[PDB]
């Protein structure tokens, strides 16, 4: 019984850790992807600016 209680508690703690880590990963992923899209957009508008310079 003692071993069972300790094991179950350790398991539950680790499980909740797992869930929270997943949520953190998701949020950081969303922010990083938004930054990535921002970078692609800035580079593309930069190139458009370069081509505008080429025009004039």
């Amino acid at each position: 019984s003692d071993k069972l209680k300790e094991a179950e508690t350790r398991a539950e703690f680790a499980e909740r850790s797992v869930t929270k880590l997943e949520k953190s990963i998701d949020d950081l992923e969303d922010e990083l992807y938004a930054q990535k899209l921002k970078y692609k957009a800035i580079s593309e508008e930069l190139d458009h600016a370069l081509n505008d310079m080429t025009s004039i």
């Binding site: 692609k40 081509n51 505008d52 025009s55």
Partner: protein, 371 residues
């Protein structure tokens, strides 16, 4: 009170109160019924998403424009678009506001009469007035003469005006516009492997056209350069990945404007219908029209068109005249800015078609003195 300067257009409805600089709400004019079955219950699924809402759910809709070429082909959908514009994008009941619609030149009468009948019976406005889309674009430039080429998305028309006196016998209306360029681009993209068929993917091809295409200064030299080097190939990321690379399709799509034989149209390009429209005018106002050529409308926003057109007209015109092409940066909303200016004038305040006048003469009042 203030007047509502609506501008139906064909492709983007632009509206806003009179006296401002830019339209308050600009959104595509598409009404798309859902086409699949739908299994979730209580999701609150409507029967028709209009305006900018149907550009976000376009994956499961069948978008269909209610205005084909200037004329209106589906009156129920157009009524729905107007109702949305008044109530949700501006949130002003039409019972307390005059309206100023805009209409292309040389359009069928029944279209205009039905438009005024709707505005007076369904929405029940106090007074509405219909104006030609080119005179407004001439207002916005602050000129009083000049020949304006208003290449919209539905129809391209070329109205010459001198000293405020329009020349009705010199209006050259051509039905090539942005939509035909979208279809032609969608048709030439198939030469690399990319097939867009669904009415939703027409929007993606339109975005490609807006962001990448440009008008070549000299067509043959560009065709030769794009066939040897690879400095032109610009890539673009679809709404799901799988980037595509556009080669010499970049300047071949908008070249259709100057050679309408590409899409099988017989007529001459926008570079030669302007010269023909000028030559129909009297011999003493041709210099002023040459010097004050005005561009407007959305489709004239291609990078490098104000130079190609000037080169072409200078080739056609006599060598002594000076050819100048006015291309303001606010080209897209030029018609609406002009509409706001016209509605804000005091001299114009008695030209509205008052409701009692409509009650006495019927919808045919629009062709009468109140034009």
């Amino acid at each position: 009170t203030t007047a509502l300067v609506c501008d139906n257009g064909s492709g983007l409805v632009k509206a806003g109160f009179a006296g401002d600089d830019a339209p308050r709400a600009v959104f595509p004019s598409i009404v798309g019924r859902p086409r699949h079955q739908g299994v979730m219950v209580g999701m609150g699924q409507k029967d028709s998403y209009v305006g900018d809402e149907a550009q976000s759910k376009r994956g499961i809709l069948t978008l269909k424009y209610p205005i084909e070429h200037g004329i209106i082909t589906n009156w129920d959908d157009m009524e729905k678009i107007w109702h949305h514009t008044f109530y949700n994008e501006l949130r002003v009941a039409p019972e307390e506001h005059p309206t100023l619609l805009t209409e292309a030149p040389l359009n069928p009468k029944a279209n205009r009469e039905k438009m005024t009948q709707i505005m007076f019976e369904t929405f029940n406005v106090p007074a509405m007035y219909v104006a030609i889309q080119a005179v407004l674009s001439l207002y916005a430039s602050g000129r009083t003469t000049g020949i304006v080429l208003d290449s919209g998305d539905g129809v391209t028309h070329n109205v010459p005006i001198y000293e405020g006196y329009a020349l009705p016998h010199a209006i050259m209306r051509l039905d090539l516009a942005g939509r035909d360029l979208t279809d032609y681009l969608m048709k030439i993209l198939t030469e690399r492997g990319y097939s867009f068929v669904t009415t939703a993917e027409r929007e993606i091809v339109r975005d490609i056209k807006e962001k990448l295409c440009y008008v070549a200064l000299d067509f043959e030299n560009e065709m030769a350069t794009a066939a040897s080097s690879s400095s032109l190939e610009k890539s673009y990321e679809l709404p799901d990945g799988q980037v595509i690379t556009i080669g010499n399709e970049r300047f071949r799509c908008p070249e259709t404007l100057f050679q309408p034989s590409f899409i099988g149209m017989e007529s001459a390009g926008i570079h030669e219908t302007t010269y023909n429209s000028i030559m129909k005018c009297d011999i003493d106002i041709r210099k002023d029209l040459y010097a004050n050529n005005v561009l407007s409308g959305g489709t004239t926003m291609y990078p490098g068109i104000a130079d190609r057109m000037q080169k072409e007209i200078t080739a056609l015109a006599p060598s002594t005249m000076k050819i100048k092409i006015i291309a303001p940066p606010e080209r897209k909303y030029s018609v609406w800015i002009g509409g706001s200016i016209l509605a804000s004038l005091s001299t114009f305040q008695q030209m509205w078609i008052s409701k009692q006048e409509y009650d006495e003469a019927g919808p045919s009042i629009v062709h009468r003195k109140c034009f």
